Every structure is written in C-alpha cells, then in structure tokens.
Amino acid sequence: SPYGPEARAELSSRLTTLRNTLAPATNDPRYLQACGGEKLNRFRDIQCRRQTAVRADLNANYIQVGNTRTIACQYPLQSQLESHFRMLAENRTPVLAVLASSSEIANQRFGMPDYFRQSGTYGSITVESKMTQQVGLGDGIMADMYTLTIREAGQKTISVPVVHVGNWPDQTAVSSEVTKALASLVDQTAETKRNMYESKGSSAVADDSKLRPVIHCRAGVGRTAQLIGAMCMNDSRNSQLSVEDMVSQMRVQRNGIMVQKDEQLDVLIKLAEGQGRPLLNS
Numbered sequence: 001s002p003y004g005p006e007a008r009a010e011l012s013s014r015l016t017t018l019r020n021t022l023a024p025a026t027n028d029p030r031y032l033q034a035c036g037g038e039k040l041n042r043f044r045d046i047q048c049r050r051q052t053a054v055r056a057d058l059n060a061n062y063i064q065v066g067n068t069r070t071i072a073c074q075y076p077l078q079s080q081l082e083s084h085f086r087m088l089a090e091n092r093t094p095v096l097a098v099l100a101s102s103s104e105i106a107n108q109r110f111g112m113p114d115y116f117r118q119s120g121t122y123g124s125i126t127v128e129s130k131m132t133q134q135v136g137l138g139d140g141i142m143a144d145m146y147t148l149t150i151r152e153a154g155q156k157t158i159s160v161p162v163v164h165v166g167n168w169p170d171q172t173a174v175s176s177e178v179t180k181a182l183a184s185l186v187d188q189t190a191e192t193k194r195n196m197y198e199s200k201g202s203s204a205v206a207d208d209s210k211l212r213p214v215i216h217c218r219a220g221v222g223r224t225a226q227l228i229g230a231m232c233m234n235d236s237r238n239s240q241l242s243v244e245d246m247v248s249q250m251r252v253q254r255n256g257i258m259v260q261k262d263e264q265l266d267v268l269i270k271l272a273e274g275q276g277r278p279l280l281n282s
C-alpha cells in the first residue's frame with residue numbers, strides 16, 4: 001500500500017534527516033537572531049527562518065505550500081505585542097486562528113498574554129475584542145469566535161476575525177474529522193472577510209504578501225502545522241502535492257520542528273490517504 005508501514009517508514013527517515021539538518025546552530029545564518037537584549041524566541045530552540053520572516057522583531061514566517069499562502073507564528077511575547085498587532089492589520093488579516101488552549105493562556109507561568117479576548121492599549125495601538133460565536137467542531141472540541149478592532153492614530157481601522165480553538169492540548173493531534181471541520185471553518189471565515197475587502201476595492205487583495213490567514217498555537221509548529229497541512233489539502237489547486245513536499249516546505253520555510261509530533265503527522269497522512277494523495281516524492 002502506498003500508505004503502508006514501509007512507506008510511512010520511508011516518509012519518516014526523510015523528514016527526520018531534514019529535521020536534524022535544520023536544527024539551529026549557534027548564530028545560524030539561516031535564522032533570525034534576536035537583538036539588543038530583547039528576547040525574540042519563546043523557545044530558544046524553535047527559531048524563525050530568516051528568508052521568510054514577516055518582521056525582524058517577531059518570530060513568524062510567510063508560508064506557501066503549493067498555492068496556499070498563510071503566516072505561521074509563535075504565541076507572541078508581551079514585548080512583541082505592538083508589532084504583532086501591526087503585522088495583523090497591515091496584512092489585513094482575513095482570519096486569525098489561535099490554537100493555544102485557554103488553560104495554557106491562563107497559566108501565568110507560560111507568559112502567554114490574553115491579547116484577543118480582552119480590550120487593551122499597546123503602545124500607539126488600541127485593541128477592542130468582541131465575542132461573536134461558538135462552533136462545535138466535533139469530539140467535544142470548541143471554537144470561540146471574536147472580532148478584534150485594531151486602531152492606531154492616523155492609520156485606517158482594521159477588524160480581524162479570530163477563530164480560537166480553546167481545548168486542543170499541546171503536543172496532541174485532534175482527529176481527522178475535527179481537523180477537516182476546522183480547516184473549513186478557517187477557509188470560510190477567511191473567504192468571507194477577503195470578499196468584504198474585494199467588494200471594497202482594496203489593493204491588498206492583489207498583493208500576495210497580504211490577506212493571508214495567521215495561525216499560531218504556543219510554539220507555532222505543531223498544532224499550527226497540522227492545521228496548515230489541512231488547509232493545503234482542501235485547496236483544489238494543490239493537487240498531487242505529496243505529504244513529503246508539504247512537510248518539507250513548512251520545515252524549510254519556518255524551522256525543522258514543523259509537524260512536531262508523529263501523531264500530528266499521522267492525521268496529515270490520514271487526510272491524504274482519504275484523498276488518494278501521495279505520501280512520497282517520485
């Protein structure tokens with residue numbers, strides 16, 4: 001079987017060789033380095049590929065797999081918040097999907113600010129949050145939805161819709177069913193906001209560095225990548241993209257940890273198998 005153990009075995013030696021090869025070296029020129037003392041990375045070993053970096057002071061990357069464009073990033077640190085909101089607005093973010101649980105956010109030791117469920121002022125910017133709906137995606141997983149209104153004097157006000165999956169534990173894989181259900185909710189939400197921009201004649205709709213969904217969990221490599229992988233798979237234009245290319249592209253464009261657990265990989269393999277999609281190149 002193309003999805004047999006032998007094949008999944010081949011898939012692993014490949015991705016594994018790639019993970020070892022991309023592990024950051026001290027002052028690695030392939031990765032963005034923090035400066036002036038301020039901390040850049042949340043996890044010293046989960047770094048940000050310099051070439052595809054969105055901003056110099058955020059750990060966050062522009063990702064494209066096949067034809068799917070997104071921005072995967074780390075849960076911002078308290079200090080990175082003003083820039084993080086700038087990246088949101090100028091990207092004219094169609095949808096912010098946050099995959100970090102409320103209990104991780106609630107744990108004050110983890111240093112994960114509640115930037116999206118509460119109003120605030122971050123430097124020049126002013127944010128306002130408004131909860132809208134709650135969608136059940138299956139297996140007891142819920143997604144709460146907000147709208148963030150970002151304002152900064154002299155800039156045009158931007159609204160961003162957020163889909164927060166509040167109960168997906170770090171280091172785990174939600175099921176293929178919950179997974180595709182979430183990929184859909186994210187696309188639909190993005191497609192509705194993009195259309196609002198389109199019906200308005202914004203230039204951002206023409207620019208391919210803008211209007212990309214932003215997605216992050218805590219580290220931005222596991223839960224964030226399981227979702228990126230599924231969004232790629234429901235884009236019809238991504239036909240014949242193997243699981244090997246998909247994963248290789250996420251790793252070369254952010255870091256080697258992309259698709260952190262082997263079970264998150266497994267869900268990606270199940271969705272593929274169900275599409276008759278290929279695992280291995282050649």
Ligand code: VO4
Nearest residue numbers: 218219221222223
């Ligand atoms: O915060 V996450 O990258 O799933 O492990």
